[PDB]
């Protein structure tokens, strides 16, 4: 089974929030989220191995933000090498999970001196043939220069992983951190749409588990 | 007096330690620090308005590293605009506080799309006439391209970056900063008393009168 | 007299272009420029000491760009320490010289190893009290979060320099480079407005020379 | 064959030199290079679609630096997508081609406001299992955290970054890239024959059959 760490935003009932998931769809932590239909939102995710705290903030205009944090040592949860990505799922609604931009930075600072390793990428435009992205499910790129995670026109699942593996952590590092930001547009001609969007970190060869729809986000195989 | 927030490393007697000062020389938090004479040390200081946690890690090559954190919302401690610098102060022993490198990055990110403001600077080589640095006290630049914070007696010196840093703002969704500096503390003495720190303060900050020794040149 | 290196865009007759000025208002090089009124433009300026070539590209939507380059060793033209800024001037027209964003990066790579010095700043929003900027002339900040170089409501001159001095070059550097980008909006209810906008590099204590209006751009004292 | 653009340094006899190869081992431009044995060298490679000039500078600490440029619009030479790597090849002498550090930055900037795409990576320490690197030939990682391009005989090895780099695009206003790497070439021999290079090529590029010695492992 794939090892997943995710920060998701979803409006699926199953009894509007953002949550931090560690290997399970049963969020270790959540916070309400005033999902604004048709408005561009921004999410920032940060982590560093000194605080060992995974935090996220999602925001829309008019000071409408939401945050959530969780103390966890990712070095004990994730393998040393991972891939990172975005995932989305919809219900039986006419909705979009468009990503307008996505950036990520990962750094490893060694116990040595001036010995730092890093990876950084930023997409503000997505090409029809975006070769440094691995597309899964209904995810396509290029439409209006954006990354459409789910099929636009019921129930769709899509993911986009950055092509290269990320060395998210290492034993000989004094500090390890990463940051990710993405802007998304969830547009729906429907008032209360069932939707889910997430940023995730997984084992390198991760793929969409059989049956990972709705609240599973294309990340988890059932609500275990 | 000056509004100061510092991350300091001093061996002023009990045991060598690293601490976080929030408007006081009485560290709000400390951790043991096994200071090594003649060895290059590295310090990383991180902060972000989400966790509102200030943390620092000090390490030596092929040795254990000391870390220390502290929950503090700098938005309630510091003025919106500040300057950042490094300060040192020797007790009375023959010791040096050479800075080999120093980087800083500050970012303010507003709700609006792609509305990020950043300031970043990196020094790996210091020149005799370093105009973007405000040197105070016995602080000098140029010797081997290094930044000597103290006189190479009871010396005290600081170096602040010339430009004011918009460290926080009310319209920001996230404000963060990171700072890294490498230092080398030499001393032919056994138990040298020394202090070195990274600090953030009001713009017009200067060395308080008689702020030597344990006062790190930051506190009156 | 101040030592100025500038890349300017101006529509002043004096017989629409972009030009590279080295210590003189008599451009060492120019290129036509299809000034689009009411459209946001972007300018990119680059230089590196290996090519010793100063180049700029200005662009508006619909593939409407313009470029200009000039071979020059800035180390022989500028002092070792400088300040950098933006300047603007208008004629007897109702026009604006609004800067929406401005970024700059300067790097010095020493003959040593892993010994690099850098300075980078980016403004995507300008505060009412922007302390790390030195405002001169009619330049004000904060209006709609922008930097208005000339007074908005005849003939106005304004400049904005970044507060800290830049170590644009040094004898012991193997490579020195800088890059600057800014987006500007020149809006005018008038068809053919007289205007000028520029990015410039000057001696540290540079100020607006007496009489530097119109084509002088607030940078040069007369057309010498 | 593979579409290659390289900046190479080789001592394969006439005199040591650095050159720029554009689809051929017959350098489109060269400059003398006073190679130093046992000394760490640094190479910086820069390019931007405005000047359409590819330039490189190689230098040693406390020594002269060799530079070489060449007007070339890579948009007419390279496919839109490529991979970037380092390659080396020893002649027959006992010599090493250790890479100590390697950085790369590529940016595409469209007309639209703030529509920049960038890729940046930096290696200062190489691990035994470097998954984001495609090692070819005698190339290995881990030894002292360095990247050994050649076997430590007539050895040849390359290392490419795992992810494809969108090096250029028709909708870009400016496309630029920079690359810096530090190398150390040891050899107990007097006139060692060696070759080392930074290259950009088609995605599925691999070491051409018998591309040893002067072929730098890049040319058939």
Short mmCIF file of N, CA and C in Angstrom, two decimals, chain D residues 110-178:
data_model
loop_
_atom_site.label_atom_id
_atom_site.label_comp_id
_atom_site.label_asym_id
_atom_site.label_seq_id
_atom_site.Cartn_x
_atom_site.Cartn_y
_atom_site.Cartn_z
N UNK D 110 6.71 34.18 -19.73
CA UNK D 110 5.76 34.53 -20.78
C UNK D 110 5.38 36.00 -20.72
N UNK D 111 4.71 36.47 -21.78
CA UNK D 111 4.28 37.86 -21.86
C UNK D 111 3.35 38.18 -20.69
N UNK D 112 2.38 37.30 -20.46
CA UNK D 112 1.42 37.48 -19.37
C UNK D 112 2.11 37.86 -18.07
N UNK D 113 1.42 38.64 -17.25
CA UNK D 113 1.95 39.11 -15.98
C UNK D 113 2.26 37.98 -14.99
N UNK D 114 3.47 38.03 -14.42
CA UNK D 114 3.93 37.06 -13.44
C UNK D 114 3.77 35.59 -13.84
N UNK D 115 3.84 35.30 -15.13
CA UNK D 115 3.70 33.93 -15.61
C UNK D 115 5.07 33.31 -15.86
N UNK D 116 5.81 33.09 -14.78
CA UNK D 116 7.14 32.50 -14.87
C UNK D 116 7.15 31.04 -14.45
N UNK D 117 7.92 30.23 -15.18
CA UNK D 117 8.06 28.82 -14.86
C UNK D 117 9.53 28.59 -14.62
N UNK D 118 9.86 27.98 -13.50
CA UNK D 118 11.25 27.72 -13.19
C UNK D 118 11.51 26.33 -12.64
N UNK D 119 12.73 25.87 -12.84
CA UNK D 119 13.19 24.60 -12.32
C UNK D 119 14.54 24.92 -11.75
N UNK D 120 14.78 24.51 -10.52
CA UNK D 120 16.06 24.75 -9.89
C UNK D 120 16.47 23.59 -9.02
N UNK D 121 17.73 23.18 -9.13
CA UNK D 121 18.20 22.11 -8.28
C UNK D 121 19.63 22.40 -7.91
N UNK D 122 20.01 21.94 -6.73
CA UNK D 122 21.35 22.15 -6.25
C UNK D 122 21.79 20.92 -5.49
N UNK D 123 22.97 20.41 -5.83
CA UNK D 123 23.57 19.26 -5.17
C UNK D 123 24.88 19.73 -4.56
N UNK D 124 25.05 19.56 -3.26
CA UNK D 124 26.31 19.93 -2.63
C UNK D 124 26.84 18.68 -1.96
N UNK D 125 25.96 17.69 -1.88
CA UNK D 125 26.28 16.41 -1.27
C UNK D 125 25.52 15.33 -2.03
N UNK D 126 26.25 14.37 -2.59
CA UNK D 126 25.64 13.29 -3.35
C UNK D 126 25.54 12.02 -2.52
N UNK D 127 24.35 11.41 -2.49
CA UNK D 127 24.16 10.18 -1.72
C UNK D 127 24.29 8.91 -2.58
N UNK D 128 24.68 7.82 -1.94
CA UNK D 128 24.86 6.54 -2.63
C UNK D 128 23.68 6.21 -3.53
N UNK D 129 22.47 6.49 -3.06
CA UNK D 129 21.28 6.23 -3.85
C UNK D 129 20.61 7.54 -4.25
N UNK D 130 21.19 8.19 -5.26
CA UNK D 130 20.69 9.46 -5.75
C UNK D 130 19.62 9.20 -6.80
N UNK D 131 18.37 9.08 -6.36
CA UNK D 131 17.26 8.79 -7.26
C UNK D 131 16.88 9.86 -8.27
N UNK D 132 17.22 11.12 -8.03
CA UNK D 132 16.86 12.13 -9.03
C UNK D 132 17.93 12.35 -10.08
N UNK D 133 18.91 11.44 -10.09
CA UNK D 133 19.99 11.43 -11.06
C UNK D 133 20.00 10.13 -11.86
N UNK D 134 20.16 10.25 -13.17
CA UNK D 134 20.24 9.09 -14.04
C UNK D 134 21.72 8.87 -14.32
N UNK D 135 22.31 7.88 -13.67
CA UNK D 135 23.72 7.58 -13.85
C UNK D 135 23.93 6.65 -15.03
N UNK D 136 24.93 6.97 -15.86
CA UNK D 136 25.25 6.17 -17.03
C UNK D 136 26.74 5.91 -17.08
N UNK D 137 27.12 4.75 -17.63
CA UNK D 137 28.53 4.42 -17.71
C UNK D 137 29.13 4.08 -16.37
N UNK D 138 30.35 4.55 -16.14
CA UNK D 138 31.07 4.27 -14.90
C UNK D 138 30.74 5.26 -13.78
N UNK D 139 29.70 6.06 -13.99
CA UNK D 139 29.27 7.06 -13.03
C UNK D 139 28.69 6.47 -11.75
N UNK D 140 29.19 6.95 -10.61
CA UNK D 140 28.71 6.49 -9.31
C UNK D 140 28.63 7.66 -8.34
N UNK D 141 27.81 7.52 -7.30
CA UNK D 141 27.63 8.55 -6.28
C UNK D 141 27.84 7.95 -4.88
N UNK D 142 28.17 8.79 -3.91
CA UNK D 142 28.35 8.30 -2.56
C UNK D 142 29.75 8.44 -1.97
N UNK D 143 30.77 8.17 -2.78
CA UNK D 143 32.15 8.28 -2.31
C UNK D 143 32.41 9.68 -1.76
N UNK D 144 32.47 9.80 -0.43
CA UNK D 144 32.71 11.09 0.21
C UNK D 144 31.59 12.08 -0.12
N UNK D 145 30.46 11.57 -0.58
CA UNK D 145 29.35 12.44 -0.92
C UNK D 145 29.55 13.14 -2.25
N UNK D 146 30.54 12.69 -3.00
CA UNK D 146 30.83 13.28 -4.30
C UNK D 146 30.28 12.44 -5.44
N UNK D 147 30.20 13.05 -6.61
CA UNK D 147 29.71 12.37 -7.81
C UNK D 147 30.92 12.02 -8.67
N UNK D 148 31.29 10.74 -8.69
CA UNK D 148 32.42 10.27 -9.48
C UNK D 148 31.90 9.90 -10.87
N UNK D 149 32.25 10.72 -11.87
CA UNK D 149 31.81 10.49 -13.24
C UNK D 149 32.52 9.33 -13.93
N UNK D 150 33.80 9.12 -13.60
CA UNK D 150 34.57 8.05 -14.21
C UNK D 150 34.99 7.01 -13.18
N UNK D 151 35.38 5.84 -13.68
CA UNK D 151 35.83 4.75 -12.83
C UNK D 151 37.10 5.16 -12.10
N UNK D 152 37.10 5.06 -10.78
CA UNK D 152 38.26 5.42 -9.96
C UNK D 152 39.22 4.25 -9.82
N UNK D 153 40.72 2.86 -16.05
CA UNK D 153 41.01 2.60 -17.45
C UNK D 153 40.32 3.61 -18.36
N UNK D 154 40.06 3.25 -19.62
CA UNK D 154 39.39 4.16 -20.52
C UNK D 154 37.95 4.20 -20.06
N UNK D 155 37.69 5.02 -19.05
CA UNK D 155 36.36 5.16 -18.45
C UNK D 155 35.52 6.31 -19.00
N UNK D 156 34.21 6.11 -19.02
CA UNK D 156 33.27 7.12 -19.48
C UNK D 156 32.01 7.07 -18.62
N UNK D 157 31.51 8.24 -18.22
CA UNK D 157 30.32 8.30 -17.39
C UNK D 157 29.58 9.62 -17.48
N UNK D 158 28.27 9.55 -17.34
CA UNK D 158 27.42 10.72 -17.40
C UNK D 158 26.42 10.67 -16.26
N UNK D 159 25.86 11.82 -15.94
CA UNK D 159 24.87 11.94 -14.89
C UNK D 159 23.93 12.99 -15.39
N UNK D 160 22.67 12.62 -15.53
CA UNK D 160 21.67 13.55 -16.00
C UNK D 160 20.66 13.74 -14.90
N UNK D 161 20.01 14.89 -14.89
CA UNK D 161 18.99 15.14 -13.89
C UNK D 161 17.77 14.38 -14.35
N UNK D 162 17.09 13.76 -13.40
CA UNK D 162 15.91 12.94 -13.68
C UNK D 162 14.79 13.60 -14.43
N UNK D 163 14.43 14.81 -14.02
CA UNK D 163 13.34 15.49 -14.67
C UNK D 163 13.73 16.19 -15.97
N UNK D 164 12.81 16.21 -16.94
CA UNK D 164 12.96 16.83 -18.25
C UNK D 164 12.87 18.32 -17.98
N UNK D 165 13.66 19.09 -18.71
CA UNK D 165 13.67 20.54 -18.56
C UNK D 165 13.04 21.20 -19.78
N UNK D 166 12.01 22.01 -19.55
CA UNK D 166 11.38 22.72 -20.65
C UNK D 166 12.37 23.86 -20.90
N UNK D 167 13.34 23.63 -21.78
CA UNK D 167 14.38 24.63 -22.03
C UNK D 167 13.94 25.84 -22.85
N UNK D 168 12.94 25.67 -23.70
CA UNK D 168 12.44 26.80 -24.47
C UNK D 168 11.02 26.53 -24.91
N UNK D 169 10.32 27.58 -25.32
CA UNK D 169 8.95 27.47 -25.80
C UNK D 169 8.63 28.69 -26.65
N UNK D 170 7.75 28.50 -27.63
CA UNK D 170 7.37 29.57 -28.56
C UNK D 170 6.61 30.75 -27.95
N UNK D 171 5.95 30.53 -26.82
CA UNK D 171 5.19 31.59 -26.17
C UNK D 171 5.99 32.34 -25.11
N UNK D 172 7.27 32.00 -24.99
CA UNK D 172 8.14 32.63 -24.00
C UNK D 172 8.73 33.95 -24.50
N UNK D 173 8.85 34.92 -23.59
CA UNK D 173 9.42 36.21 -23.92
C UNK D 173 10.90 36.10 -23.63
N UNK D 174 11.22 35.28 -22.64
CA UNK D 174 12.60 35.06 -22.27
C UNK D 174 12.77 33.69 -21.65
N UNK D 175 13.82 33.00 -22.05
CA UNK D 175 14.12 31.69 -21.52
C UNK D 175 15.59 31.76 -21.20
N UNK D 176 15.93 31.38 -19.98
CA UNK D 176 17.31 31.41 -19.58
C UNK D 176 17.64 30.24 -18.71
N UNK D 177 18.93 29.94 -18.62
CA UNK D 177 19.36 28.87 -17.75
C UNK D 177 20.76 29.20 -17.34
N UNK D 178 21.12 28.69 -16.17
CA UNK D 178 22.42 28.89 -15.60
C UNK D 178 22.79 27.55 -15.02
#
